Ligand binder design. Structure first.
Ligand SMILES: [Zn+2]
Length: 53
Protein backbone atom coordinates (compact mmCIF):
# COMPACT_ATOMS: atom_id res chain seq x y z
CA UNK A 1 0.00 0.00 0.00
CA UNK A 2 1.97 2.96 1.32
CA UNK A 3 5.31 2.81 3.14
CA UNK A 4 6.44 6.20 4.42
CA UNK A 5 5.86 9.49 2.61
CA UNK A 6 9.07 10.85 1.09
CA UNK A 7 10.48 10.63 4.60
CA UNK A 8 12.97 8.68 6.71
CA UNK A 9 12.31 6.26 9.56
CA UNK A 10 15.11 7.51 11.82
CA UNK A 11 12.82 9.06 14.43
CA UNK A 12 13.24 8.45 18.16
CA UNK A 13 10.29 7.12 20.16
CA UNK A 14 9.12 9.10 23.19
CA UNK A 15 8.60 7.69 26.68
CA UNK A 16 5.77 9.95 27.85
CA UNK A 17 3.46 10.29 24.85
CA UNK A 18 5.30 7.57 22.93
CA UNK A 19 5.29 9.51 19.66
CA UNK A 20 7.93 9.46 16.92
CA UNK A 21 10.04 12.61 16.60
CA UNK A 22 13.00 13.84 14.54
CA UNK A 23 16.41 12.64 15.79
CA UNK A 24 18.20 15.99 15.45
CA UNK A 25 15.68 17.47 17.89
CA UNK A 26 16.12 16.92 21.63
CA UNK A 27 12.80 17.83 23.25
CA UNK A 28 9.49 16.21 22.29
CA UNK A 29 7.22 18.68 20.48
CA UNK A 30 4.40 16.31 21.40
CA UNK A 31 4.59 16.44 25.19
CA UNK A 32 7.44 18.94 25.53
CA UNK A 33 9.29 16.20 27.40
CA UNK A 34 13.07 15.83 27.09
CA UNK A 35 14.33 12.27 26.61
CA UNK A 36 16.13 10.88 29.66
CA UNK A 37 19.42 8.96 29.77
CA UNK A 38 20.80 6.27 32.08
CA UNK A 39 24.51 5.94 32.82
CA UNK A 40 24.43 2.98 35.22
CA UNK A 41 27.95 3.71 36.49
CA UNK A 42 29.58 0.38 37.33
CA UNK A 43 33.28 0.51 36.46
CA UNK A 44 35.89 2.98 35.20
CA UNK A 45 38.06 2.53 32.11
CA UNK A 46 41.56 2.75 33.59
CA UNK A 47 42.57 3.36 29.97
CA UNK A 48 42.12 6.65 28.13
CA UNK A 49 43.73 6.26 24.71
CA UNK A 50 43.94 2.63 23.56
CA UNK A 51 41.78 -0.27 24.76
CA UNK A 52 42.63 -3.83 25.79
CA UNK A 53 40.50 -6.95 25.52
ZN1 LIG B 1 6.50 12.95 23.88
Amino acid sequence: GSSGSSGSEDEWQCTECKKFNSPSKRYCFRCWALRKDWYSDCSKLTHSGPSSG
